[PDB]
């Protein structure tokens, strides 16, 4: 049971295995973050819901000082282990974004929240914590799925595995409402689009499927 979850989580970084689609999606998110935030080199960055560290590590490679948060024990161990093998320094912490926000307010140039909004009982609380974590003038990114989108992480690990990692879509309008109640200002939104025929992802207008939001403090 824990054994089964450990087996699945252990394949996180096989580029040609079951986590393939997550590795294909990442360069598009990384690219959007780097473009919208004006580079990651020299920046202090928080990845909220970092899983096995696909995004976290890709940001550290471009020269950011990255912290990864996840409440899921197993994925976080896999993140630590991979960073150890790769020689990339990333600080991975098992705590809630709320806990981290209470200890580290205003410390981060960039906050990314790319995976767990649609899985947590209180997404509004996540949005408020991310806003508290970022410096004045810093960037906060969200990524989630609309009603007709797909949670690719849940596609890979399954719904049961997600529930172990937490105490199923977010309307862009809901997200905008939550953002408006904070010091964050929405700047840009884009769709993350998937072609089932060629199995390719791309960014573009239209947010009926998956989407990413750029905000600034």
**SS3 (DSSP) at 204:** strand
Query: Torsion angle of alpha carbons 132, 133, 139, 141, nearest 10°?
Result: -90
DSSP label at residue 1: -
Q: Report H helices in 113-202.
A: 123-133, 152-157, 159-164, 172-180
How many Å apart are CA 96 and CA 166, to the nearest integer? 10
Q: Tell me the domain boundaries of the chain.
A: 1-217
Residue 27 neighbours by CB under 8 Å, 6+ apart: 58
Cα separation, 196 vs 200, in Å, equals: 7
Using alpha carbons, select from 49, 24, 46 the residue that is nearest to residue 37.
46
Instruction: Tell me how the structure was determined.
Output: X-ray
Residue 71, annotated ligand binder? no
Alpha carbon distance 18, 155 (integer Å): 10
Separation between Cα atoms, residue 121 and residue 184, nearest integer Å: 22
Q: Given 3.40.50.150, 3.30.70.890, 3.40.50.300, 2.60.120.10, which CATH number is that of 1-217?
A: 3.40.50.150
Contacts of 200 (CB under 8 A, 6+ apart): 24, 194
DSSP bridge pairs for 150: none
Contact 200, 139 (CB under 8 A): no
Q: Residues of 74-87 as b/e, b for ≥16 C-beta within 10 angstroms?
A: bbbbbbbbbbeeee
122 assigned binding-site residue: no
Residue 49 assigned to a binding site: yes
State how far the Cα of 136 lies from the Cα of 132, in Å rounded to an integer: 10
Contact predicate 126/96, CB 8 Å: no
Q: Please, are residues 131 and 164 in contact by the beta-carbon 8 Å criterion?
A: no
Q: How many CB atoms lie within 10 A of CB 39?
A: 13
């Amino acid at each position: 049971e824990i054994a089964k979850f450990e087996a699945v989580a252990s394949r996180w970084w096989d580029l040609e295995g079951e986590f393939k689609p997550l590795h294909r999606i990442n360069p598009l998110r990384l690219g959007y973050i780097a473009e919208r935030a004006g580079g990651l080199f020299g920046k202090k960055v928080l990845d909220v819901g970092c899983g096995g560290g696909i995004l976290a590590e890709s940001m550290a490679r471009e020269g950011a000082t990255v912290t990864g948060l996840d409440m899921g024990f197993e994925p976080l161990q896999v993140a630590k282990l991979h960073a150890l093998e790769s020689g990339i320094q990333v600080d991975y912490v098992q705590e809630t974004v709320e806990e981290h926000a209470a200890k580290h307010a205003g410390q981060y140039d960039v906050v990314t929240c790319m995976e767990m909004l649609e899985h947590v009982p209180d997404p509004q609380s996540v949005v408020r914590a991310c806003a508290q974590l970022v410096k004045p003038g810093g960037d906060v990114f969200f990524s989630t799925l609309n009603r007709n989108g797909k949670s690719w992480l849940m596609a890979v690990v399954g719904a049961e595995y997600i529930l172990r990692m937490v105490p199923k879509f977010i309307k862009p309008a809901e997200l905008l409402g939550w953002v408006d109640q904070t010091s964050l200002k929405e700047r840009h939104i884009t769709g993350l689009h998937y072609n089932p025929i060629t199995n390719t992802f791309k960014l573009g207008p239209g947010v009926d499927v998956n989407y990413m939001l750029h905000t600034q403090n």
